[PDB]
Amino acid sequence: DPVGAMLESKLLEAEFSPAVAAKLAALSQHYTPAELVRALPQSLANMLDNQGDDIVRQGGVVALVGPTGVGKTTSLAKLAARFAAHHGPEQVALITTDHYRIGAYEQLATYGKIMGCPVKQAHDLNELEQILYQFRNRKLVLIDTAGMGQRDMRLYQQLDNLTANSRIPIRSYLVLSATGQRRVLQDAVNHFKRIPLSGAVLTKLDESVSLAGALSVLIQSGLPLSYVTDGQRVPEDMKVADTLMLAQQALATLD
Amino acid sequence: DPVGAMLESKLLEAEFSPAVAAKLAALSQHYTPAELVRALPQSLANMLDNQGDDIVRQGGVVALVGPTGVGKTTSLAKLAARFAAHHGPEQVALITTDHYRIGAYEQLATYGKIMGCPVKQAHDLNELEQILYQFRNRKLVLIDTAGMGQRDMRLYQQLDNLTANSRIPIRSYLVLSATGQRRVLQDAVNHFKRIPLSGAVLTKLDESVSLAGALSVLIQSGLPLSYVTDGQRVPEDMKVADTLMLAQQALATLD
Numbered sequence: 395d396p397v398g399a400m401l402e403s404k405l406l407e408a409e410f411s412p413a414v415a416a417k418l419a420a421l422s423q424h425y426t427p428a429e430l431v432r433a434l435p436q437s438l439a440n441m442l443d444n445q446g447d448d449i450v451r452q453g454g455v456v457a458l459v460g461p462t463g464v465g466k467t468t469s470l471a472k473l474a475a476r477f478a479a480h481h482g483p484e485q486v487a488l489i490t491t492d493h494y495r496i497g498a499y500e501q502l503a504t505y506g507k508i509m510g511c512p513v514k515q516a517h518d519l520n521e522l523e524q525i526l527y528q529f530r531n532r533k534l535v536l537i538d539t540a541g542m543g544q545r546d547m548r549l550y551q552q553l554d555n556l557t558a559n560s561r562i563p564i565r566s567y568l569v570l571s572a573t574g575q576r577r578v579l580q581d582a583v584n585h586f587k588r589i590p591l592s593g594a595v596l597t598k599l600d601e602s603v604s605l606a607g608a609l610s611v612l613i614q615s616g617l618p619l620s621y622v623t624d625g626q627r628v629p630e631d632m633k634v635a636d637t638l639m640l641a642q643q644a645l646a647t648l649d
Numbered sequence: 650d651p652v653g654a655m656l657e658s659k660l661l662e663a664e665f666s667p668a669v670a671a672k673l674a675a676l677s678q679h680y681t682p683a684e685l686v687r688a689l690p691q692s693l694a695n696m697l698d699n700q701g702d703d704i705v706r707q708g709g710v711v712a713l714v715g716p717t718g719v720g721k722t723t724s725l726a727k728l729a730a731r732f733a734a735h736h737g738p739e740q741v742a743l744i745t746t747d748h749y750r751i752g753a754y755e756q757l758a759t760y761g762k763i764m765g766c767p768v769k770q771a772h773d774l775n776e777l778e779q780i781l782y783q784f785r786n787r788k789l790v791l792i793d794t795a796g797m798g799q800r801d802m803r804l805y806q807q808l809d810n811l812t813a814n815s816r817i818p819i820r821s822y823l824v825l826s827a828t829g830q831r832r833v834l835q836d837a838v839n840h841f842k843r844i845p846l847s848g849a850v851l852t853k854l855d856e857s858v859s860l861a862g863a864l865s866v867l868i869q870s871g872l873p874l875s876y877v878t879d880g881q882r883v884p885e886d887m888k889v890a891d892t893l894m895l896a897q898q899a900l901a902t903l904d
């Protein structure tokens with residue numbers, strides 16, 4: 395298969411994962427060279443499986459989980475404001491389960507003042523369950539978990555709490571930085587998938603050289619790409635993932 | 650060159666950079682297969698050019714610079730305690746030039762209470778120059794800069810301040826996470842080298858799959874590897890870089 399082999403080779407060189415590089419290489423068997431120009435991005439975008447801004451339209455209890463310094467707190471704040479700009483701040487509340495960082499409550503509490511929404515800290519499961527029922531009238535409750543290394547033995551503590559009691563449904567979104575090595579991102583995914591994840595938030599596109607590995611990991615892991623962030627400005631440096639745009643960007647190396 | 654080619658190929662597969670992979674491949678021309686077992690790690694360790702714990706023995710004004718969430722504040726605190734455990738806390742002082750983060754002073758100020766050392770915030774250059782002369786009797790002054798994306802247009806602001814006035818010498822150390830893609834780390838290096846750097850701090854070895862790319866970037870950029878961090882525990886999760894150990898770890902893929 396002459397064309398299939400060149401495509402795959404180039405896709406690997408452009409930092410796509412072996413699995414995705416093959417799947418994309420494969421459509422050279424169903425398309426014209428010319429059709430392929432549009433078919434490559436379109437297939438990649440499709441695979442990334444974006445679900446609009448589900449947080450905003452759907453609400454509910456949403457938790458951000460992920461390894462250290464990826465931007466969970468920053469992306470949480472962006473989401474809060476987003477939801478509040480439609481709807482209203484009286485409909486948003488914030489929780490942190492991070493009793494590690496030097497005064498995590500204070501950072502998040504300060505965002506609360508800025509954005510006009512209550513902020514509570516859960517020290518354990520019982521308290522989290524109280525706070526969530528207490529906030530039942532809120533349309534969006536955002537939970538900020540503690541950043542930990544994906545192989546940290548404490549990890550399950552932060553994670554299993556979000557999936558305990560089958561009558562508080564919680565949608566957990568994995569926050570990953572697009573700067574990470576492909577294998578690190580995959581390692582993170584594998585360990586964090588200890589609980590069901592509803593999608594991924596991809597941060598630091600403004601620091602990234604290439605999105606190919608990051609996008610590949612999401613494809614491979616069957617994680618929808620929900621939102622992207624591209625700077626430090628709260629709240630505007632967040633977008634609903636436009637997967638076609640992202641696909642195009644990632645494939646521009648080949649061109 | 651049969652052996653040279655296989656070595657390079659394997660080294661590339663183990664995620665070493667083209668430049669370093671070639672240099673290491675090259676010593677198969679000067680060593681026995683058996684001598685090579687020890688010569689590979691030894692050459693790689695040599696290239697990483699560690700300078701003991703220079704901060705501790707030497708002191709002076711030390712600044713940590715680097716992109717977002719890499720662990721500048723956390724590594725600063727570790728260094729402070731290290732210096733204080735030898736010598737004393739009355740010999741250490743802390744400065745932050747980060748007037749961006751929601752109350753950066755408070756985090757660092759809280760470490761100050763913990764570790765028994767004064768903490769000041771510089772809002773501009775003049776104030777930094779005052780604070781440093783004010784702290785002239787301190788043997789170590791540690792400066793925590795604001796984390797920014799390596800291509801952030803504000804970057805020079807944080808950086809040029811550390812190199813203004815040729816009568817306050819400051820040693821800047823680049824803090825980089827070992828989780829980052831090789832090309833991102835290199836991109837970071839290139840932009841941060843807008844000022845002279847004295848070395849690198851390599852963080853999050855406990856989150857890393859492989860050190861090969863990270864080590865390669867330091868080699869290529871001629872940046873000494875000063876310290877490594879391998880967890881979130883302040884202050885003990887920091888070591889002087891044992892380059893031979895690191896070299897061995899990075900090369901164990903080939904085995």
Ligand SMILES: Nc1nc2c(ncn2[C@@H]2O[C@H](COP(=O)(O)OP(=O)(O)O)[C@@H](O)[C@H]2O)c(=O)[nH]1
Pocket residue numbers: 461462463464465466467468469541597598599600601623624625626631717718796797798
């Ligand atoms: N350049 C860039 N920096 C970001 C982005 N998101 C977060 N950051 C920074 O990454 C650092 C970590 O932010 P934080 O929300 O506390 O990460 P967390 O520890 O997971 O909660 C901070 O310096 C943020 O400003 C992004 O999209 N682009």
Ligand SMILES: Nc1nc2c(ncn2[C@@H]2O[C@H](COP(=O)(O)OP(=O)(O)O)[C@@H](O)[C@H]2O)c(=O)[nH]1
Pocket residue numbers: 462463541542543716717718719720721722723724796852853854855856878879880881886
């Ligand atoms: N697993 C691991 N996490 C680290 C390490 N160093 C810092 N972190 C975490 O990375 C996050 C960023 O810490 P911080 O010092 O504020 O990074 P900064 O924004 O550059 O100052 C925090 O959650 C730290 O706990 C490390 O060596 N290993």
